[PDB]
Each structure stands twice: as C-alpha cells, then as structure tokens.
Design a protein around this ligand. Structure first.
Ligand SMILES: CN(C)c1cccc2c(S(=O)(=O)NCCCCNC(=O)CCS)cccc12
Ligand SMILES: CN(C)c1cccc2c(S(=O)(=O)NCCCCNC(=O)CCS)cccc12
Ligand SMILES: [Zn+2]
Ligand SMILES: [Zn+2]
Ligand SMILES: [Zn+2]
Ligand SMILES: [Zn+2]
Lengths: 216, 216
C-alpha cells in the first residue's frame, strides 16, 4: 500500500523501499539499492512491480544519471519484479546463471545478462557480486560496495529469523553464512531485504539463525 | 564451561555472564547485572550456580562494595540459582510473590523478600522492578535503571526468537510485550538474558516475535 521510498544511505548509495501484503505479516517492506558511479546508476534488486521500477528509474534519470542496469540478488519477485519492465525498455538486466534457471522454471522472464562463479565484477572495484552458496534460496547472491564498505545482503541476511523455508536450503545455509561472515566481516553497513540496516553483526546473527534453523 | 565474566556496561553498571550447556544449543550465556548505588552493590539476577554467585559477590566485595541485595527476574534457575548462597550469607534476596510461589512448587529455596504490583522500587527512584504480565514465564519481571535509561529485559526480551515455551503464556506475551514497549520505549540500552545488549528496538522486536509466536 505505501509508496516507493528512495533515501540516501551514503555517498552515491541510495536505499529503495517498495511494499507488499504478506500472509500474517501485513505490509512487509523490501529494500534494494541504487549505486551511483559517475553519472551512471545501478539498481541492486528491483521493486516488486513494473510501476515502482519505472518510478525508481525515472527518479534517477530526471536527476541526470543514466540507468546502466540492474542486478538481482535472487529469483523471488521482490528482487526480480522489475526485470520484465526493464528488458522491454532495453535496460540491461543481470542475474546469476542459477537465478535465471530458477526464474525460467517459475515461469518468469530472465535477466538479459547472466554470470556464474564465486565473484562477479559488475563495476570493477565499485560494485561486486558475491555468491556465498545456497541459503534463503539456492541462488542468493550479495552485492559488495568496496568503496563504502557496504554489503547488500538481500534476503540471505535474516538476523531475526530465516523466513519461509520453502525454496531454502537449510542444510547448507549455515556453511554459506559462515563463508559470508568471514569474507565481509569488515563491512560497515549490512543491508537486509526485510529489516533495518545494521552492521557486520547481522552476519553473525544470520549464521546463528541458520544453525538454529538446521538444528530443527 | 566458560568462566564467569564481569564487564562494565555503563557508569555504576556491570554485566555478569555465566554459562550453561543447553540441549541442542551448545554453551549458552546468561547475562545479569550488578548495579552500584554508592559503595553498595545490587545483583540483578544471579548466576546458575553457587560457586559462580560466590565468585560474583567476591569480585565486588574485594572492591569495597557491600552486597545490599539481589533481585530475580523469574523463577528459572538461570535467574535464581544463587538465592540459596546469598541467603546463607544473609544477603537480602528479592523476588515477586509469583516467582516465590513458583520457586516453592519447584522445591527451591525462596527469596527472603517478596514484592508485588506492576511496579516496585527495589531502591526508590534508583532501581525499578516492572511486571509486564505473563510471557516467557507467568512471573517474569524486568528491572529498570532510571538514571542510565538501562532496562534489564531478562528472559522476557527475545528479539530473535522466543525460546522454550514450556512455561510460557503465548496468548499473553504479545499483550505484555506491548505494555513493556510503551512503558520503556525511552530506554537507551536493553539487556537480554541470552543475547547481546541492544537499544529500545529490542522491545519492538520482542513484541513482533511474541505476535509471530502466537500466530504460529
Ligand atoms: C519478528 N521479527 C523479529 C522479524 C522482523 C522482520 C523480519 C522477520 C523475518 S523476514 O526477514 O523473513 N521478513 C518477514 C517475511 C517476509 C516474507 N517475504 C517473502 O517470502 C518474499 C520473498 S523473500 C522472519 C522472521 C522474523 C522477523
Ligand atoms: C539465533 N539467534 C538469533 C539467537 C541468539 C540468541 C538467543 C536466541 C533465542 S533465546 O534468547 O530464547 N535463548 C536461546 C536458548 C537459551 C536456553 N536457556 C534456557 O532456556 C534457560 C531458561 S530461561 C531464541 C532464538 C534465537 C536466538
Ligand atoms: Zn526470497
Ligand atoms: Zn525477500
Ligand atoms: Zn527462563
Ligand atoms: Zn533464561
């Protein structure tokens, strides 16, 4: 119900928040980022709908930035809901090979550009995509902004609880959460998809929740 | 297995941590406080055992502090484990009537002093005991320190999950959490029994966990 929000998080980094009604949760927020790189803008996850994605893109274009593309952290529509629109407007979309594979199987439009491997450099030294392994979804990846020490953890970061385990790999989440914690322990800010921005401690909390989750 | 820990949290306020092995959780920490009121020390919750309670009391006695009293947040042994030792040394012990009634049914030694009501002053205007209502247990109470705006949530504050529900009142917890949040939303620090120290946001998280728990 609430309208898309676009707030500055740090120099060249904005958080975009869109909303959706969830079973028993009420209206749940979804956070993504827009990273500025010299008159160029990059979307870290897209809003749920084409509407907000269009709104998001226009906000930045009307401010002088050229939308260079969007990268989605995992296949769920809260990260990929705007790929359909962006593609139809010939705006480059990116998703990991596992994400596109999951998207196709779920009857969803795929990102135009895909990648695989542990690391993927969208913008050398400015925007880096990391795959810690299966967790929330088999494909979840995180986005590391080296210059600001900011880590967008997406739906993988779950400090207060794992959430729906339907498409999750609870058996491997702890291992993945451990690798992520050791790779980005120096993060100044960790941005979750469904809860407040915090610090490197959300890495630890996510790991403990995964361990607790598997134990059950 | 880890040794009792005593760390300063703020002026005149220390956090004491004892440890236990907890079925499927590994070594779990238990936090309590020691509040200093002019050369006199007050224990907020005791360690699990007598030897640790002794270690705690001695740490402060050897520093010129008279142990003026200790209050237990609820009847479980992680809050009351040292009442026996303290009484044996004539150190004033406090617990609400409900806690004392539950301690009796548990065949445990009772606090020498009992109180009741929504709020009780262990030390007028310096240390407040608040009863939000049933939650983790039917008797859980919290301790508020007015000067430093520090709230010891005890085992009732569960921002990451409720924990064992065997002695809990899940139907009332959310109501109790609501009351605690509106009463202590001004807290600067909220100290849970089994997780890191945080701010007023732990109250909100707790409420949401209670709600989620009731629904589940
Ligand atoms: C209770 N309280 C501690 C919580 C606050 C914020 C988020 C919590 C989550 S969550 O972080 O999981 N977000 C809520 C569910 C959002 C559901 N959305 C989807 O499934 C969309 C695709 S990812 C899980 C458990 C608990 C959460
Ligand atoms: C996963 N991670 C986020 C967590 C960290 C710290 C505490 C968590 C709790 S908890 O805060 O509930 N305590 C953990 C079990 C403590 C066991 N000790 C007792 O039951 C003694 C009697 S009160 C619940 C869920 C999750 C917790
Ligand atoms: Zn998801
Ligand atoms: Zn999500
Ligand atoms: Zn307890
Ligand atoms: Zn406890």
């Amino acid at each position: 119900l609430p309208d898309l929000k676009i707030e500055k998080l740090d120099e060249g980094v904005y958080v975009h928040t869109s909303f959706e009604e969830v079973n028993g949760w009420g209206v749940v927020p979804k956070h993504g980022l827009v990273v500025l790189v010299n008159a160029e803008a990059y979307l870290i996850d897209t809003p749920f709908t084409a509407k907000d994605t269009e709104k998001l893109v226009t906000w930045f274009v009307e401010r002088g930035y050229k939308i260079k593309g969007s990268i989605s952290s995992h296949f769920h529509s809260d990260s990929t809901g705007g790929i359909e629109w962006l593609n139809s407007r010939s705006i480059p979309t990116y998703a990991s090979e596992l994400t596109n594979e999951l998207l196709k199987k779920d009857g969803k439009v795929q990102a135009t550009n895909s990648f695989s491997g542990v690391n993927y450099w969208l913008v050398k030294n400015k925007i880096e995509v990391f795959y810690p392994g299966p967790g929330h979804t088999p494909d979840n990846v995180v986005v590391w902004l080296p210059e600001r020490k900011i880590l967008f953890g997406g739906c993988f970061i779950k400090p207060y609880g794992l959430g729906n385990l339907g498409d999750a790999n609870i058996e491997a989440w702890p291992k993945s959460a451990k690798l992520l914690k050791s790779k980005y322990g120096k993060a100044k800010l960790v941005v979750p998809s469904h809860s407040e921005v915090g610090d490197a401690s959300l890495l630890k909390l996510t790991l403990e929740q995964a361990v607790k989750g598997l134990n059950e």
